[PDB]
Ligand binder design. Structure first.
Ligand SMILES: O=C(O)C[C@H]1NC(=O)NC1=O
Ligand SMILES: O=C(O)C[C@H]1NC(=O)NC1=O
Ligand SMILES: O=C(O)C[C@H]1NC(=O)NC1=O
Ligand SMILES: O=C(O)C[C@H]1NC(=O)NC1=O
Ligand SMILES: O=C(O)C[C@H]1NC(=O)NC1=O
Ligand SMILES: O=C(O)C[C@H]1NC(=O)NC1=O
Lengths: 245, 245, 245, 245, 245, 245
């Protein structure tokens, strides 16, 4: 009845599997999850250069989703790359996982702490806090100091580091909830919530619920003004397939 | 399967009916709506004095809801009176309608305009924008300059004034969506959305979807720190029934 | 000549005595202090639930004060519960102790540190800093980690903890003054100011001086717009005695 | 018993008379007002260049006041020139009239409007709003578009323009109080308050009450850190008389 | 001696010519301007979708510039697309034209007004104001309500509309300078500055001077932390040529 | 061809020499540096009192510079004393060294750390961060805890303390660049940049490049509104020589 395209903005199939599993686990009856990733791009997003590439990969999948007539989209990287670009191209609502996780956090706690993977991505999360208006609601931001793909390397080291950092955050930061800062951390939320007795929030699952909510409310992206469909123009070279509508 | 207590913070049964109808219209399969209002309080909330009274009325119903073992609560007045107080008392999540409407607005538009009823309540909405962190996302705030209960007087004047103000807001404000600033405007959202071809958002319906989402995510109010259950103490006089837990 | 109603929002007579003593100690010649507390409510305010109850208790006393024809009111809890509600109901000015202490602090120092009692009340103080616009003027917020009523238990432990925390704040925070974050700390200000050679500010005494100042200036709460007397309506049950005017 | 030096930062004796009259009118029993102005400087302050000159003139009088052993000081220009410099040099508290008027405004209204004299001084008032943290509390800023000294030219034109602008501000701005943006407007506050039935606030009178309040509280400028007495050094030329202490 | 790559992020050669002419007109002796545009992309940037495409086009040229060993780069669209991504990839400094124009404006005026082309791009300029921290320095933002490429259509209509809007801005906004909000407006700055007797600032010319300044200071992008070279990884498909270093 | 007056706001000839050397080292071909200091004032600026004195000393030199017909001015103290006053008096652009250093820092790094000399001057730097709008771009502010003139005492202790503090800042703060917080640190920038492999920015050299840039762009201070020449009036006593124009 409801079809939601969950887009992993990086090209890692391993991370797409983790994201897809988290999305399906919370999906309402009648909801089909279409877990996808770009055909071309970057295996993991670890900075501004990676984000710019990922943004176009998102748009390629948004185009595919709109052609399929999906009800909504999820951008499944914690930088929410190409969010507003995607909202212009898509008819159905587009929700970022950082956006969704932060939104949910303010509903269950006064302040939250972010636990992400790489230190150099903290600035990206800081920018999003300011952009979304949740800076005052964020007590602290932390990184476990590992490459993004360490969450998929099977060692369990990244997962243990997340757990330890969450425990330390709840003791030190003066926050009531944890926002997981990675699509690769998606399947950790439930176990950490049960273990630590506080909301540990995965943006993937949260974004799925936001799309479902908006669809049930009969609400989609405003095509009045800022997020209207892109102005009609000829796209050249590698970009010519992005807007056939 | 899921029971959500939707609390009208004012004592108007007429407004409770409007709020209850909007909540049931969007409720997911398996969701039961318990539309309630305080036994004692104020017929409509039109200022800070009214809000303080309404806040205690909310708590009385929160207590009743928790005794019944409901899955979540909705505070159905645009000032979200007693929101954090309710989150302390309740186990299940508590979502305000102003909170929910503003949250939804940022997901479908870059900026939104608020249309409320009385001018003196604009300051309350301004304070909430700052508190929730959506001040930059709000292009303008407007009032139709009628008493709150004019929405329930059967004349249709308030409803027409809302429509006209929404049209003018979309032309002048530089916004892409409308946030309805009253529980009494709840049943107007769908018709105005279809008519104006932009998201016109009712917080009542939005808050219901937020509660459903949080319950499906296995998330509830953090009892770690700020929103923990109230400290054990003896309440005197009229307040003695508020915390029997 | 000038009568000021100093309202302890909690029901502790012990704290009312401390607050009353601090108010009378600085009162100008011709000023009578009416130290009161609600007939029904909470013994101490330690969270949002407690604040909501205290707010209505304040209003009950505001009503009594206005009937007596007092020149002004003081809300003597560091959360300033029901401040704007009280300003609507009262004719004479209403000053919160957090408000007054913060206002005074900016007049004698570039930045101040707050020392309150319970950790879970720090968020309430943070919210007030943002609401009043003094966030940039506050270097740090601290709690001594004891129940509010520990200040009245006769052990002197809370008083010693305040002193030690003030010393540590002045060494570490980069602030020039201390704002005491409790009505129960009211009588500590003078001794700590003399001992530490910096302004240690009690909001109770400060608020009394603000009321006296406004009365001498011939200024009272604006009844134009936002803080006008509450709209005429029937209050039901426990609330029916709040607005007989 | 209490001696307060009220410093007009400009060299206009006419404005010093207006400022002195406003200060004495509200002074508590036992308070002596010492109305002064710099021996050298600028007849009126109408920009940043004028402010820089006025700041040094303030310091010259602060030095004189401290030599006389006055209990406190008032800086009686709406730009509060040399406020922090004065607080370093003086032992007793130093209160600016813009500072005091804005502080009082937030105690009697949710939002205020500023009415000053020259348009080019609006930016100075804007900067002070941000510095003091009252930007959100200011609904609008207006200028009557006349030279500062027009208030002293005997025509009554400036006074009528202030009145008309206050009436228009209360109708349009969505504010509950007026802050007078000139030391030359000081004696207009009472009449406008009575006429318009809202708080029309003069910073001169307000600052006097703030000094009296701080003295009665046993509070003075913190000499710990930022506002400590200036570091011991040799001042050359025209400045050699500024710090003989 | 100094080679600066000035990148037009859109594919319009006409706009590249305008941008190149403005860059060469102010270039210091010894400075060579390399005016370029992407081989693939969008003819004009008129929204978030266009920006995402332009960002990758910028990166393609950044790669080419770094291979050539240029001293610095300029991103010549008013949305500064891919600015931080470019700073990661490039060794020499990368300056956006919106960034440079806003920076220059604060050095010659207290507040500035922005005049851009399309209304839907105003939100992009608003976001940059917040990101760069110049929101308080911007009095107003305006659009002439024409397509971006109207500046290159030879009619002179867009140019006249810019002039008229600048005149109206200086009369109404309370600003002292104009920031031109288009790379297509680059060659209008000098004539408008001379005509209106105020700074009318072109970001293209300003950014060139910023690059020259940084090179002369011996300063380049920090490779410590956030703007370090992208993490070593395999780029697939259309993106494989972006990082051969 | 281009003459830039670089004003040391303090009276230390030793610091004037350091400032002058840094300015000449980066000056473009054809640029003459006029390194000056006030005839009367303070040997070093270490607080608000010192700043007020320095501001008038700056104006005395601005007057001299304008009489000589210089192309621009630099205010060479990290508090940028009398910046807006100087912009009113001068025809050519006036750039502060704190202003210039902060501006440059945002062009080469996401966030910067400030290293100044005396702790009591940190508040002045904090105020400038807010005024210029770079608060979010500043990760931390540090002082080496020595008198300002320790940089000129020949011991090399201050220079070593700056180096050590820069190393610690880059390890702890999460910043990519260092802003030197003293005119006395001007000649340290190049060596520290080469040693630490990050941008270590001197405001003196940066401000010189900003003046050169503005002159080449044909841009000067706006005389429309806020920064117009001071209103024509008689200056008395020591101030009578400040505005002979
Ligand atoms: O994973 C991270 O830490 C951040 C972001 N990067 C990415 O490839 N997926 C993400 O969610
Ligand atoms: O209705 C309004 O305008 C505001 C708020 N007052 C109220 O009684 N219900 C509400 O939603
Ligand atoms: O005391 C505190 O710490 C905070 C606040 N609670 C209270 O009962 N009185 C108060 O002033
Ligand atoms: O008067 C004004 O408008 C502003 C300010 N200038 C001055 O000479 N005295 C003042 O209060
Ligand atoms: O031109 C504009 O209005 C904005 C931006 N778009 C673009 O194609 N070049 C620009 O500078
Ligand atoms: O030097 C400092 O630390 C700050 C400031 N004071 C001064 O005399 N020159 C300056 O740059």
């Amino acid at each position: 009845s409801v079809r939601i395209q969950v887009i992993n903005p990086n090209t890692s199939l391993a991370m797409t599997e983790t994201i897809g599993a988290a999305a399906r686990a919370v999906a309402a009856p009648g909801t089909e999850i279409l877990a996808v990733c770009p055909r071309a791009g970057v295996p993991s997003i670890e900075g501004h250069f990676d984000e710019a590439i990922a943004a176009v990969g998102v748009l390629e999948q948004i185009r595919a989703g709109r052609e399929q007539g999906v009800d909504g989209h999820v951008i499944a990287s914690f930088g929410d790359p190409g969010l507003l670009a995607a909202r212009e191209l898509a008819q159905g609502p587009v929700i970022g996982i950082a956006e969704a996780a932060m939104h949910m956090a303010t509903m269950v706690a006064t302040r939250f702490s972010i636990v992400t993977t790489l230190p150099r991505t903290l600035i990206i999360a800081r920018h999003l806090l300011h952009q979304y208006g949740f800076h005052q609601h964020c007590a602290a931001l932390h990184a476990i100091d590992l490459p993004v793909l360490a969450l998929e390397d099977g060692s369990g080291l990244a997962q243990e580091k997340v757990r330890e950092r969450c425990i330390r955050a709840l003791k030190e930061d003066g926050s009531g909830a944890i926002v997981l800062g990675s699509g690769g951390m998606a399947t950790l939320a439930q176990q950490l919530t049960r273990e630590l007795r506080v909301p540990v929030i995965d943006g993937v699952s949260a974004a799925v619920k936001m799309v479902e909510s908006l669809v049930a409310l009969g609400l989609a992206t405003s095509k009045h003004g800022d997020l209207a469909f892109p102005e009609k123009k000829a796209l050249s070279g590698q970009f010519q397939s992005l807007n056939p509508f």
